[PDB]
Amino acid sequence: NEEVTFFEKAKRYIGNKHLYTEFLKILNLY
Amino acid sequence: DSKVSVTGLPLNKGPSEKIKRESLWNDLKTFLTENMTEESNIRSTIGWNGIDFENEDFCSACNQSGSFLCCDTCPKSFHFLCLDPPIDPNNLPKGDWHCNECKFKIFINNSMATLKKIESNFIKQNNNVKIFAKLLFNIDSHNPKQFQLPNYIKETFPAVKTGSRGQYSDENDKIPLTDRQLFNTSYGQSITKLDSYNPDTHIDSNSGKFLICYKCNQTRLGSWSHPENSRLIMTCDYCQTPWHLDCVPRASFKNLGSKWKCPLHSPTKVYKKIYKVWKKQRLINKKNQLYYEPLQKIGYQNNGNIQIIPKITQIDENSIKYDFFDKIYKSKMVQKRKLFQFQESLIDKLVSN
Amino acid sequence: VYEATPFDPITVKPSDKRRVAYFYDADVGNYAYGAGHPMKPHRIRMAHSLIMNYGLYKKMEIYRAKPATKQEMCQFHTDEYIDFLSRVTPDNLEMFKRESVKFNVGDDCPVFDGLYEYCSISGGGSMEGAARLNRGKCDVAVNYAGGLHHAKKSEASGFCYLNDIVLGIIELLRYHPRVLYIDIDVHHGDGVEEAFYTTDRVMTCSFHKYGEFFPGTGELRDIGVGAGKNYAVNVPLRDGIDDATYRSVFEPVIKKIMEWYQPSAVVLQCGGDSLSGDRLGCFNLSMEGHANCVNYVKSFGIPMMVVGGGGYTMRNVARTWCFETGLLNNVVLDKDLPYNEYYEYYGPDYKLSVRPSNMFNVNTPEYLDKVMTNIFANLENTKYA
Amino acid sequence: XXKXX
Amino acid sequence: KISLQIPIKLKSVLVDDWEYVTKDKKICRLPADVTVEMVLNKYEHEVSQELESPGSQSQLSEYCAGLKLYFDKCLGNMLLYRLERLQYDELLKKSSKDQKPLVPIRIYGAIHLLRLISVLPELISSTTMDLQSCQLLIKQTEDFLVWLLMHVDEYFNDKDPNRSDDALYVNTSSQYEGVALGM
Ligand SMILES: [K+]
Ligand SMILES: [K+]
Ligand SMILES: [Zn+2]
Ligand SMILES: [Zn+2]
Ligand SMILES: [Zn+2]
Ligand SMILES: [Zn+2]
Ligand SMILES: [Zn+2]
């Protein structure tokens, strides 16, 4: 319900695509 | 006494007319001391008593510069540690020093029929290891070398380049500074440290707009009727994200050693501290890097070596979402049931009294 | 937690009257590193003349510490390095070509003449200076020929062949539990920080310029290892720092250190290449913004030991050292210089003041906020002395 | 590198 | 010309070793815990039970003995970087002092054997062997390489000399680097 909103908020706030990719790589490593 | 000093002329000589023309317009109380100083030896440790050719200008082995022991027959020169076996620079045997190759030649008397003879006898003797016979015979004809990887090994990884003196470089080397030979000359006080001029370091070179810092979301260009409001923007060398020097707490411009890396790249080495090591491979290009797209999405582990699509595992944002949420949910509930069981065991142990 | 402040003049404290001892060997000034190297032991002679023409000899005792022996030098350095230093000379140097590369004593630090004797004078002055602080029998100990804070255990670096600050601090540690060492040179005191990097009995604190600058050590994240973790403070700054900014950074850090560490003795290295118009430094301090640090460290009232250091312009260093010694003796000296032997070095004004430039200052308030917040967060863990 | 000379 | 196939994991091991001995200024920790003799003895003692025919065993034993002799004779000549020749000299000194000759197979680990293997094709192509014998040597070396790749997790760990201890590499002081490189 709200976690979809969390991931969309992160995708919006990062603003870029390479930065969002690096963010997803950090999340995968964890 | 007539020999010139720092001043330009002999010491017992006044200034010339050229210097005085181009440099012109047109009792004391430390007599004492030998009366007031009295020695101090109050310290604790005062008990302690207390073909006329010339040799090359580089080593034949490592191909570098230094102080060489040279060979008379051939123009080779070697460092002292670059020999076999290494020689002490003090206790050097004088007399005639020859290298391995010239010594081999003078030993065989420059006759290769004798080379036939000795090599045939050698291969007859080394019958135990007959495969390594001829090899074991050639090693004695070569001057020493240093190790350098074969080029069919260095070229498997394309981000790897041999440095100037055969050193390792891996794309994190910024570059040597070429017009920083031009920097020793410079434009006057217009420094390479990037001081006193930041109107055009806040402006995107190609597009034309301003570079906006990632953390504070402003390009503090200041105003050059008040230059104390500028804030020294710098861009990352990999993703080109701009940051202020006061936001990434750095106080420098990275100019010489390596490339500066934004806080927005994940790791390249971890040190889990549980301690274990890397989850990141090397870039094996040459078009031998094969990818895999697993048929199961929400459980695949495979490495920390993924590639994100809309051996390297191809994974998508949805599987990352699900894996993150699953991990945190199950760790949450497991730690909560552990605390639950611990506290209930505590209550039955305390009421047991 | 930084906040801007002005710079009010220096007024001495009438209560803090300390029996100062001054160490000077009339031979140290005659040993010159080379033609054109920027190191002159002549700047220690110049200073002394000023100190003697202002009448400051009637106020303190003047001594001449007996020079260190090869076996009091090896309390820190190794026997091979000290033997090399004792044996080498500019003529037999070609015979020592393997130790000139091992011990680094050929060209940045050259072999010039009576090098062993200069090192002996420095070390003996400082060990003796510190030894008179332990025997109960001084309050401040001045020795300007010391302050070679770059020399390592078995290597010379930075024009320094013998680390005598370490010998002095070892001599201090025989009676004092905790010792503090403050370094206000423009460089990093890398030898003193290396020698006491894993111990919780000496706390080093150095304010330096960090960048692509010699020696390239001393980041904010170097805080020690082992039992001496959080007992090493590095404050890196940018070019052109001024008196008010340096004051607003210096005083809170040092007050916090003294409140949580509670040292038993101090050692302040007041090398003056952080002044304006130096040959190697990049700061923009004046004479009084440089002596305010000494006055503040003297405020707290514990046994103190002031040593020399760098300084590449001779007149600026001479005048600053004279002024600092004067205010250590609880007087502010006149600004008109008296007639002394080196009167003509101090043109064109012939006054006791060092002038700053209009250089641009790049140390913003938010950078110093971040630095001081990190430093205080670290220091929070050294309280229970 | 080093300090000047 | 001769061609040898090396697994890419061992190629990355070699590139890592080239990175360490070069701009990281590290040397190896000697005497190693697992030397060349131990690796080759374990390999031969594990494989000799594999195939039954006596000829395979004779060839295996001859290859291992020749590899030992050749590493002994080649290590100082061609297998050392320039930073690691001061270590070689110090070992040679402390050996000659004790009236004992240096035997490199009982000191040096598996990374130097890997160096020798990688450099083998050029040494083979510089001699005047047969072609059958070159291909026999290459076959034996490729079999050894796959066996060693099966054990790569046992001889080539990463342990950060700077962090805990007993890694396969050690840091050098400025005196070692001054006398070794810049002399
Ligand atoms: K400093
Ligand atoms: K410490
Ligand atoms: Zn060489
Ligand atoms: Zn020759
Ligand atoms: Zn910002
Ligand atoms: Zn970046
Ligand atoms: Zn300095």
**Contact yes or no for B266 and A29 at CB 8 A:** yes
The length of chain E in residues reads 183
Q: How far apart are CA B9 and CA B15, in angstroms?
A: 8
Dist. CA C215 → ligand 1 center (Å) = 11
CB E138 within 8 A of CB E125: no
What is the number of H-type helices and E-type strands within chain D?
Answer: 0, 0
Tell me how far the alpha carbon of residue B336 is from its chain's centroid. Answer: 48
DSSP percent split of chain A into helix, strand, coil, nearest 5: 80, 0, 20
E71 token code pair: 């590493």
Residues of B in contact with E123 (CB under 8 A): 135, 138
Tell me how far the alpha carbon of residue B350 is from its chain's centroid. Answer: 62
Q: How far apart are CA C22 and CA C61, in angstroms?
A: 6
B289 token code pair: 């890097």
CA neighbor of C306 nearest in space, from C163, C165, C158: C165
CB C276 within 8 A of CB C284: yes
Q: How far apart are CA B324 and CA B273, in angstroms?
A: 21
CA neighbor of C192 nearest in space, from C221, C220, C158: C158
CB E48 within 8 A of CB E57: yes
Q: How far apart are CA B129 and CA E64, in angstroms?
A: 9
CA neighbor of C278 nearest in space, from C356, C212, C183: C356
CA neighbor of B61 nearest in space, from B169, B158, B147: B147
CB C316 within 8 A of CB C277: yes
CA neighbor of C316 nearest in space, from C282, C276, C281, C269: C276
- Tell whether the torsion through CA atoms of E124, E128, E129 and E131 is positive or negative: positive
Q: Where are the alpha helices (DSSP H) in chain C?
A: 42-53, 70-73, 79-87, 99-102, 115-134, 164-172, 190-195, 243-260, 288-299, 314-328, 365-379
Q: How far apart are CA B148 and CA E81, in angstroms?
A: 8
Nearest chain B residue to A18 by CA distance is B239
Q: Enumerate residues with CB within 5 Å of ligand 5 (an ion).
A: B 213, 215-216, 244, 247
What is the number of H-type helices and E-type strands within chain A?
Answer: 2, 0
CA distances from A8 to B110, B258, B264 (A): 81, 36, 19
CA distances from C141 to B330, C324, E158 (A): 66, 13, 52
Provide the shortest C-alpha distance from residue C27 to chain B (in Å): 12
C246 token code pair: 């340096």
Dist. CA B233 → ligand 5 center (Å) = 8
Question: Any idea which residues of C carry the catalytic annotation?
Answer: 150
Give the β-pairing of B69-70 and B77-78: antiparallel
Q: How far apart are CA E144 and CA E67, in angstroms?
A: 11
Q: Where are the alpha helices (DSSP H) in E34-181?
A: 36-47, 54-78, 85-97, 110-125, 132-155, 174-180
For E94, residues 6+ apart whose C-beta sits below 8 A from its C-beta are none
Burial (CB < 10 A; 0-12, 13-18, 19+), residue E134, is middle
User: Which amino acid is it at C315?
Assistant: R
Query: Which residues in B142-175 are b (16+ Cβ under 10 Å) and which e?
Result: bbbbbbebeeebbebbeebeeeeebebbeeeeee
**Residue B223 DSSP label:** B
A21 token code pair: 């990719």
Q: How far apart are CA C68 and CA E17, in angstroms?
A: 47
CA neighbor of C246 nearest in space, from C235, C256, C257: C235
C232 token code pair: 């090493």
Burial (CB < 10 A; 0-12, 13-18, 19+), residue B192, is middle
Phi, psi of E170 (to 5 degrees): -135, 150
C257 token code pair: 């250190």
User: What 3-state DSSP class applies to B77?
Assistant: strand
For C312, residues 6+ apart whose C-beta sits below 8 A from its C-beta are C38, C39, C273, C278, C279, C280, C281
Q: How far apart are CA B170 and CA B163, in angstroms?
A: 10
Q: How far apart are CA C105 and CA C99, in angstroms?
A: 8
Residues of E in contact with C98 (CB under 8 A): 179, 183
User: Which amino acid is it at C360?
Assistant: F
CA neighbor of C184 nearest in space, from C224, C147, C146, C144: C147
Tell me how far the alpha carbon of residue C30 is from its chain's centroid. Answer: 21
C66 token code pair: 């007996």
Q: Where are the alpha helices (DSSP H) in B161-229?
A: 181-185
Q: How far apart are CA E1 and CA E124, in angstroms?
A: 9
Q: How far apart are CA A7 and CA B324, in angstroms?
A: 11
Q: Which of B35, B44, B81 to mutate to test the interface with C (most CBs of C within 10 A)?
A: B44
- Tell whether the torsion through CA atoms of C166, C171, C173 and C176 is positive or negative: negative
CB C350 within 8 A of CB C344: no
Tell me how far the alpha carbon of residue B87 is from its chain's centroid. Answer: 30
Phi, psi of C320 (to 5 degrees): -65, -40
Q: How far apart are CA C374 and CA C377, in angstroms?
A: 5
User: What 3-state DSSP class applies to A20?
Assistant: helix
Q: How far apart are CA C172 and CA B60, in angstroms?
A: 54
**Contact yes or no for E119 and B275 at CB 8 A:** no
Edge-to-edge order in the sheet of strand B38-40: B38-40, C61-65, C20-23, C140-143, C304-307, C265-269, C179-183, C202-209, C232-237
CB C250 within 8 A of CB C283: no
Nearest chain D residue to C35 by CA distance is D5
Q: How far apart are CA B302 and CA B288, in angstroms?
A: 19
C vs E: CB pairs below 8 A: 16
Q: How far apart are CA B321 and CA C249, in angstroms?
A: 46
Cis check for the bond before C348: say yes or no (omega within 30 of 0): yes
Name the packing angle between helices C288-299 and C243-260 (round to 10°): 20
Q: How far apart are CA B229 and CA C364, in angstroms?
A: 9
For A28, residues 6+ apart whose C-beta sits below 8 A from its C-beta are B304, B306, B315, B320, B323
Q: Is C237 on the interface with B (CB under 8 A)?
A: yes
Name the packing angle between helices E132-155 and E54-78 (round to 10°): 80
CA distances from C368 to B304, C231, C361 (A): 38, 20, 13
C254 token code pair: 């040092």
Q: Is C178 on the interface with B (CB under 8 A)?
A: no
CB B264 within 8 A of CB A17: no
- Chain E 79-138, residues with CB within 8 Å of chain B CB atoms: 79-82, 85-86, 88-89, 92, 115, 118-119, 121-124, 126-129, 133, 136-137
Q: How far apart are CA B62 and CA B167, in angstroms?
A: 12
Q: How far apart are CA B66 and CA B56, in angstroms?
A: 11
Q: How far apart are CA E142 and CA E151, in angstroms?
A: 14
R_g over Cα of chain E: 17
Q: How far apart are CA C360 and CA C284, in angstroms?
A: 9
CB C323 within 8 A of CB C135: no
Q: How far apart are CA B113 and CA B267, in angstroms?
A: 63
Q: How far apart are CA C232 and CA C245, in angstroms?
A: 22
**Contact yes or no for C101 and E174 at CB 8 A:** no
CB E145 within 8 A of CB E6: yes
**Contact yes or no for B265 and A21 at CB 8 A:** no
**Contact yes or no for B40 and C174 at CB 8 A:** no
* Partner-chain residue, chosen from D1, D2, D4, that has the shortest CB–CB distance to C38: D4
Phi, psi of C209 (to 5 degrees): -95, 120
CB E113 within 8 A of CB B118: no
C282 token code pair: 């990049």
Q: Domain C20-385 has what CATH class? A: alpha beta
CB B179 within 8 A of CB E40: no
**Residue E105 DSSP label:** G
E150 token code pair: 């099966």
B2 token code pair: 């007539």
E91 token code pair: 């070992």
CA distances from B56 to B84, B348, C331 (A): 19, 88, 68
Neighbours of C174 (CB within 10 A): 11
CA neighbor of C173 nearest in space, from C202, C145, C196, C151: C202
**Residue B202 DSSP label:** S
CA neighbor of E70 nearest in space, from E30, E117, E31: E117
Dist. CA B236 → ligand 6 center (Å) = 5
Q: How far apart are CA C118 and CA C41, in angstroms?
A: 9
Beta bridge pairs of residue B226: B223
What are the E-state strand segments in B247-311? 291-292, 306-308
Q: Which ligand is nearest to the CA of C198?
A: 2
Technique that determined the structure: cryo-EM
CA neighbor of A20 nearest in space, from B317, C200, C344: B317
For C384, residues 6+ apart whose C-beta sits below 8 A from its C-beta are none
Phi, psi of A21 (to 5 degrees): -65, -45
Beta bridge pairs of residue C234: C206
CB B77 within 8 A of CB B71: yes
Burial (CB < 10 A; 0-12, 13-18, 19+), residue E131, is exposed
CA neighbor of C52 nearest in space, from C340, C367, C371: C340
CA distances from C196 to B121, B236, C228, E30 (A): 65, 36, 8, 30
Q: How far apart are CA C104 and CA C122, in angstroms?
A: 20
Domain boundaries defined on chain C: 20-385
For C277, residues 6+ apart whose C-beta sits below 8 A from its C-beta are C313, C316, C354, C355, C357
DSSP for B304-329, written as a single string: S-EEE---EEEE-HHHHHHHHHHHHH
* Partner-chain residue, chosen from B33, B43, B90, that has the shortest CB–CB distance to C26: B33
Edge-to-edge order in the sheet of strand B312-315: B291-292, B312-315, B306-308
| H-helix or E-strand spanning residue C306 | strand C304-307
B91 token code pair: 């206790």
Q: How far apart are CA B12 and CA C226, in angstroms?
A: 61
CA neighbor of B78 nearest in space, from B96, B95, B99: B99
CB E103 within 8 A of CB E96: no
Q: How far apart are CA C166 and CA E137, in angstroms?
A: 61
| H-helix or E-strand spanning residue C142 | strand C140-143
CB B312 within 8 A of CB B306: yes
Dist. CA E97 → ligand 4 center (Å) = 30
B244 token code pair: 């202020």
Gaps (C–N > 2.5 Å) in chain E: which residues precede them? none
Compute the half-sphere exposure of residue B327: CA atoms within 13 Å on the CB side of its CA: 14
Tell me how far the alpha carbon of residue B16 is from its chain's centroid. Answer: 52
DSSP for B6-39, written as a single string: TTSS-SS----TTHHHHSS----S-S-STTT-EE
Phi, psi of C307 (to 5 degrees): -120, 165
For B48, residues 6+ apart whose C-beta sits below 8 A from its C-beta are C69, C71, C72
Q: How far apart are CA E66 and CA E70, in angstroms?
A: 6
- Chain C 69-98, residues with CB within 8 Å of chain B CB atoms: 69-73, 75, 97-98
Query: Which residues in C326-360 are b (16+ Cβ under 10 Å) and which e?
Result: bbbbbeebeeebbebebeeebeeeeebebebeebe
Q: Is B146 on the interface with E (CB under 8 A)?
A: yes
CB B200 within 8 A of CB B206: no
Q: How far apart are CA B317 and CA B309, in angstroms?
A: 8
Angle at E16 between CA E15 and CA E19, to 5 degrees: 90
Dist. CA C115 → ligand 1 center (Å) = 25
For C12, residues 6+ apart whose C-beta sits below 8 A from its C-beta are C295, C327, C330, C331, C332
Angle at C172 between CA C166 and CA C176, to 5 degrees: 135
Q: How far apart are CA C234 and CA C277, in angstroms?
A: 24
**Residue C9 DSSP label:** P
